[PDB]
Design a protein around this nucleic acid. Structure first.
Ligand code: NA
Ligand code: NA
Lengths: 247, 249
DNA sequence: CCGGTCGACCGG
DNA sequence: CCGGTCGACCGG
């Protein structure tokens, strides 16, 4: 993480910030502004990076050659845009925000990528853990990490910022950082219904995993497979059995 | 529907109307409610606005059990209720508020009949997937309860699609569609399991040919739900197990 | 022509 | 500790 070494400074700048009263989205913009100020050469919106990548490679045209620019099957999977979009890219037609884009902010240095995702939380109440990442997308990432031996190329981190209401605006009250690959892979909760999303509040996540990235992957995949079997069996009990008497 | 008869008026006041850019389409939903509140005042309520009135018109009724008695129907209660602690802690000084869970956006009731209006916005500058309509699971439970209690002429669930696009510093509505759920072929509803188990379709293209009974609709969908769930159970092994079984050793 | 992904919420 | 629900998004 390129953000962690300066976390304390971020937590300091955010706490006390205000935004005009999804929902607390604007906070992710403050994180960007601050990350751009103290890590200008590493901070990129995901699309900003893609635009930058294609701009400095004029000779290269067409999706086939443009995909080769990533130089990584995994990063390609996680960052890349569509085929017809990589083909139609140009100076006069750049990449813009995309709702399902993997990362909020991308930090790159020495060929190392940090995929940052900002989660906002309303403290006034005690809600359910938010969507972290697709358990399936993650499952595919690990598989590719293994097929290509890319175990030192990137990290997936999360920054949570809690806000509270105060009049006609929202105010940051807390913050918390956590790395996905530092937590115990076999303990991630997979909410199948909620878009097969992994869920957890950042401030609760554990960070004591002490094995290799390759073991993390392999271990996650076993957890993923298991729960997929459990879900398949429970689906029958909850969505089928209690409704047969109507057929 | 209490909206169908004035669908032309709603469309008229929406098409071409601009709103300053800031969902990014909420403004149109607000415009729909405001119109309805001004042209069918006694029938229009925001889901939570209803619950409060219901509770307010019965001050002597405190405690959840009694308050739950106010709905006079299990099906509706399932669809409109707020839960134990929330229902119990309710007071005139601690009113119900909007909840991003509420089954409906707008409620229109008359002669004890209810219309659950859920309005869908769509950015026409993009050709996107069919959006979430309603939980197939919540639908299945609703159908079970309609049957178990014989409530087949109590309510309807309808949708209003509001098409819009960005134009300079503003947003403008360019079209509008309307459809009734209980008029579509139930065996045709697509249930997207991963997408919160929601049924998905573009209001614009929804079929309205169902000519059978409501009870027949309720039972038909239930069969369709069960089968799809079974089929899904099989799919999951195929997509999320078989191809990754080679990394577990 | 089928379905995955982002966002973030409480009741039990 | 567990897990549905709303919203609205294009590629494979
Ligand atoms: Na995410
Ligand atoms: Na809905």
């Amino acid at each position: 993480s390129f953000i962690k070494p300066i976390y304390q400074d971020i937590n300091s700048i955010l706490i006390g910030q205000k935004v005009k009263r999804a929902a607390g989205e604007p906070f992710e913009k403050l994180v960007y502004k601050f990350l751009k100020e103290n890590l200008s050469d590493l901070t990129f919106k995901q699309y900003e990076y893609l635009n930058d990548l294609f701009m400095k490679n004029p000779a290269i045209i067409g999706h086939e050659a443009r995909y080769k620019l990533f130089n990584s099957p995994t990063l390609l999977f996680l960052l890349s845009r569509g085929k017809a979009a990589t083909e139609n890219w140009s100076i006069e037609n750049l990449f813009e925000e995309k709702q399902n884009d993997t990362a909020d902010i991308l930090l790159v240095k020495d060929q190392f990528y940090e995929l940052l995702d900002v989660k906002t939380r309303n403290i006034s109440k005690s809600a359910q853990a938010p969507n972290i990442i697709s358990a399936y997308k993650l499952a595919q990432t690990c598989a590719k990490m293994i097929d290509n031996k890319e175990f030192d190329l990137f990290d997936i981190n999360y920054l949570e910022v809690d806000w509270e209401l105060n009049g006609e605006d929202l105010v940051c009250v807390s913050t918390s950082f956590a790395e996905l690959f530092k937590s115990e892979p076999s303990e991630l909760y997979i909410n199948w219904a909620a878009a097969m999303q992994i869920q957890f509040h950042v401030r609760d996540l554990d960070q004591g995993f002490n094995g290799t990235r390759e073991e993390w992957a392999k271990s996650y995949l076993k957890h993923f497979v298991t729960q997929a079997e459990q879900r398949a069996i429970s689906m029958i009990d909850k969505f089928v059995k209690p409704f047969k008497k109507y057929i």
